[PDB]
mmCIF file of C-alpha atoms in Angstrom:
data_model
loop_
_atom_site.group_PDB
_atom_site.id
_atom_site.type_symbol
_atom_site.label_atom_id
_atom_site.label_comp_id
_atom_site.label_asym_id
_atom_site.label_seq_id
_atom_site.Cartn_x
_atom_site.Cartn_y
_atom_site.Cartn_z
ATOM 1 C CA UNK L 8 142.175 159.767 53.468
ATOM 2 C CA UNK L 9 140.540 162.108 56.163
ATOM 3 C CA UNK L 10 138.352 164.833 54.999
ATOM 4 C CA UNK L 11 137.729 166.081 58.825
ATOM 5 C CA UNK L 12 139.144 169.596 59.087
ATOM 6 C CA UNK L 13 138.160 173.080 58.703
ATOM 7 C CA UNK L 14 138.550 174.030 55.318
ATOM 8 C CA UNK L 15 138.709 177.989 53.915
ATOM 9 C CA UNK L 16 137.599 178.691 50.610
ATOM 10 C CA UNK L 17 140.885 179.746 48.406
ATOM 11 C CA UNK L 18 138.705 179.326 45.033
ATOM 12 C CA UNK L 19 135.553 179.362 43.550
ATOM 13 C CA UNK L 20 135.040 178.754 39.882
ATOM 14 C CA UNK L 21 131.428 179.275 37.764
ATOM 15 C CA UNK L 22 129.217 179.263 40.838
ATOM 16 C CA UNK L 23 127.508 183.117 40.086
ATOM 17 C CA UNK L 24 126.911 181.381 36.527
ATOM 18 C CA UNK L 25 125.709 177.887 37.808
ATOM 19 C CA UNK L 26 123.168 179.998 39.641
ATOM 20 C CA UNK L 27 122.193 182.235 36.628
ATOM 21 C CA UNK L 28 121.388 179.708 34.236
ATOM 22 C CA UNK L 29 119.071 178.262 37.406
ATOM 23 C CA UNK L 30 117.118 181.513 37.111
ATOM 24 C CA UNK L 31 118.876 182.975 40.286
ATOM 25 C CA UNK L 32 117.995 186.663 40.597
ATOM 26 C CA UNK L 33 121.309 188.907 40.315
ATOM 27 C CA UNK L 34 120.655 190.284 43.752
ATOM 28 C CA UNK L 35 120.511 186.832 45.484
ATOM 29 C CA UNK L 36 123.447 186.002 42.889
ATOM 30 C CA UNK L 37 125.477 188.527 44.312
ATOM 31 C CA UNK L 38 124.893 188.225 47.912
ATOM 32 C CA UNK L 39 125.978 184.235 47.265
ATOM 33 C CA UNK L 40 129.441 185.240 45.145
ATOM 34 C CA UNK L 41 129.905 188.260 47.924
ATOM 35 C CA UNK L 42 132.774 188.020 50.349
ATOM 36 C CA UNK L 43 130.192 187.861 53.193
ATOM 37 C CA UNK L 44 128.159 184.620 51.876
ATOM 38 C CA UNK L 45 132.291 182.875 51.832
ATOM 39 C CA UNK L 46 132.092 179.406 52.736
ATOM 40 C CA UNK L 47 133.685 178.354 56.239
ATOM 41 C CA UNK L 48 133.165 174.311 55.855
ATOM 42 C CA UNK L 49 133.700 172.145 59.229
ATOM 43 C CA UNK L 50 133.710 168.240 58.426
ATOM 44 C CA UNK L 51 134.005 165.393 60.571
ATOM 45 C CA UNK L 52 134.584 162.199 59.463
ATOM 46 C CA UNK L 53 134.429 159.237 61.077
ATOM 47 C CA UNK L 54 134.620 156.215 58.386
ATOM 48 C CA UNK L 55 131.870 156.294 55.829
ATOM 49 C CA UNK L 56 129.684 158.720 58.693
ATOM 50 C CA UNK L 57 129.974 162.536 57.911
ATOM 51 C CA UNK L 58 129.345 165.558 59.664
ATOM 52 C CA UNK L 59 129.569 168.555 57.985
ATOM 53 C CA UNK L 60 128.860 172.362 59.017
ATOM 54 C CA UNK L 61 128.833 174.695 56.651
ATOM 55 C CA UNK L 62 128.799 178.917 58.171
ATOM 56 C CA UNK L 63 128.778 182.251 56.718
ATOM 57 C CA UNK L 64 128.958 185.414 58.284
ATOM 58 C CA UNK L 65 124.996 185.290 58.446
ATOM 59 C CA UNK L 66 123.806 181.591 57.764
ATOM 60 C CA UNK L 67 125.091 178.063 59.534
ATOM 61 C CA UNK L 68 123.704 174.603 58.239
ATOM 62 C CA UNK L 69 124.707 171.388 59.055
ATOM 63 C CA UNK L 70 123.971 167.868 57.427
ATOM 64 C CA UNK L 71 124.618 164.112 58.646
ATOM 65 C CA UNK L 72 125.013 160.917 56.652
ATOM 66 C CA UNK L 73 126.349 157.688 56.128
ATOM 67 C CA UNK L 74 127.904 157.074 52.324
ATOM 68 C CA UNK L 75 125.419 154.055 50.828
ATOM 69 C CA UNK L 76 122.616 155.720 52.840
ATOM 70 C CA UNK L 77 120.096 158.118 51.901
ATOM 71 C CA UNK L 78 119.272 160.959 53.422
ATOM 72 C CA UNK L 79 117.451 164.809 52.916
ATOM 73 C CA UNK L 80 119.150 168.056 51.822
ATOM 74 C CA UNK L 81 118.767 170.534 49.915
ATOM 75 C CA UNK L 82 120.322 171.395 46.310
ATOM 76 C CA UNK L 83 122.313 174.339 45.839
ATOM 77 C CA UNK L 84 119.158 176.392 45.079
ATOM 78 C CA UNK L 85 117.634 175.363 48.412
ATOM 79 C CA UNK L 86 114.739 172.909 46.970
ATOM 80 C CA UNK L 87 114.242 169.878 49.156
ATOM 81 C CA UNK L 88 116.150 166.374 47.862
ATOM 82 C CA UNK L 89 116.835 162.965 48.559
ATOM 83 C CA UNK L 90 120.621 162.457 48.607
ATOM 84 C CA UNK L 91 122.763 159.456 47.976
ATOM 85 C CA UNK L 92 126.358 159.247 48.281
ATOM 86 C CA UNK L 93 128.265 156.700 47.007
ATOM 87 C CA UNK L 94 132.817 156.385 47.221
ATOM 88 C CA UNK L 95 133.814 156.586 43.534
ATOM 89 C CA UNK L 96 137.418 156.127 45.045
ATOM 90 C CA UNK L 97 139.175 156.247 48.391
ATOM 91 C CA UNK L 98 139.689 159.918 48.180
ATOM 92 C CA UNK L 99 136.629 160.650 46.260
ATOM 93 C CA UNK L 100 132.770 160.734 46.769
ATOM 94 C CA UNK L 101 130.120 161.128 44.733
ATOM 95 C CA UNK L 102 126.565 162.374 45.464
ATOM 96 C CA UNK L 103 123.146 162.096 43.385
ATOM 97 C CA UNK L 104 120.189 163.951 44.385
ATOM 98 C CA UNK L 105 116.561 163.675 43.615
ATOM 99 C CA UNK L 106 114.078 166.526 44.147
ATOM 100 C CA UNK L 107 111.007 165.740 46.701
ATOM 101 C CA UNK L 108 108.391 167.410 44.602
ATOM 102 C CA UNK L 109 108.389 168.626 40.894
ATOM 103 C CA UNK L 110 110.958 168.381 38.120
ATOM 104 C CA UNK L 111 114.189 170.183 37.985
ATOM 105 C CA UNK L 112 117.907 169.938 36.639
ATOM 106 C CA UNK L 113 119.400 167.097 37.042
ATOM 107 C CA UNK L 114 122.236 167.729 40.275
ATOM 108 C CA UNK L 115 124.889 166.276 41.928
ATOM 109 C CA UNK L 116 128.187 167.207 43.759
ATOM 110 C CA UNK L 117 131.044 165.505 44.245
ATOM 111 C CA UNK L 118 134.577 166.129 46.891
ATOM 112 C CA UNK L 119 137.805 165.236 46.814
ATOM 113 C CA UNK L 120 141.016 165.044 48.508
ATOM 114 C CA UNK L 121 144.113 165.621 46.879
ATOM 115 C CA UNK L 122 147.712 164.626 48.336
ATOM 116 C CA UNK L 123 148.305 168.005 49.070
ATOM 117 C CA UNK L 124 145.668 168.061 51.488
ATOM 118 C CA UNK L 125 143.032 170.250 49.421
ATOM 119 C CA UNK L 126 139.279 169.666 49.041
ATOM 120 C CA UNK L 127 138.063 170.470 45.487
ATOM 121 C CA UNK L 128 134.157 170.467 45.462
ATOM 122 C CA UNK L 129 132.457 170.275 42.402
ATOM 123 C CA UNK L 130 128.622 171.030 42.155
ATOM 124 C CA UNK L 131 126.798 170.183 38.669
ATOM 125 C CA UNK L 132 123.363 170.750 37.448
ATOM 126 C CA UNK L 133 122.832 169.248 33.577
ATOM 127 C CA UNK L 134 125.474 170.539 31.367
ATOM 128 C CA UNK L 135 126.996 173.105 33.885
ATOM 129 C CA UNK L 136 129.625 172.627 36.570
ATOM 130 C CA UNK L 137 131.130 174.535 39.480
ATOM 131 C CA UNK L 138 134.002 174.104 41.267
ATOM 132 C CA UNK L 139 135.234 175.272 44.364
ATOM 133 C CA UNK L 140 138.563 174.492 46.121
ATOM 134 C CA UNK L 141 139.670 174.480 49.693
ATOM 135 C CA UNK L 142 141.794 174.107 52.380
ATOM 136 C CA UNK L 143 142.585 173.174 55.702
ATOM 137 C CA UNK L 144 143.766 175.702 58.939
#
């Protein structure tokens, strides 16, 4: 299982509610659900080492890590966290995050590669989940 590629948003399921119920202004909401904040994800995978670049049409971020290693992000609201990723199975990891300073939801995302060569994200803070599905050009 290779999740290097570069993957094209084809769904996107709860995420304008995930970021409601976070307190997400509806402006902000909006220009994250718009067709300009889409998603282009570039990962490269090398073993348990990640890259992975994620680019809209106005923002580009990218993050390294090793699974089993922990490293800083930031959760899907932007605040600061410590992330560990661990493989739940070959095709599927599994991330938990702790924030850096204060309290907060508790997050987490997890990916996924099916046979049929798409990524399904999901992204989950307490009770709520999103998911998002890709694939590869």
């Amino acid at each position: 299982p290779n999740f290097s590629g570069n993957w094209k948003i084809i769904r996107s399921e709860n995420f304008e509610e995930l970021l409601k119920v976070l307190g997400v202004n509806v402006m902000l909401r909006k220009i994250a659900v718009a067709a300009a904040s889409k998603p282009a994800v570039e990962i490269k995978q090398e073993g348990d080492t990640f890259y992975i670049k994620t680019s809209t049409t106005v923002e580009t971020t990218e993050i390294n890590f090793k699974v089993g290693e922990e490293f800083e992000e930031q959760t899907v609201d932007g605040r600061p966290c410590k992330s560990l990723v661990k493989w739940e199975s070959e095709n599927k990891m599994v991330c938990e995050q702790k924030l850096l300073k204060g309290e907060g939801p508790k997050t987490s995302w997890t990916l996924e590669l099916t046979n049929d060569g798409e990524l399904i994200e999901t992204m989950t803070a307490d009770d709520v989940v999103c998911t998002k599905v890709y694939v590869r050009e």
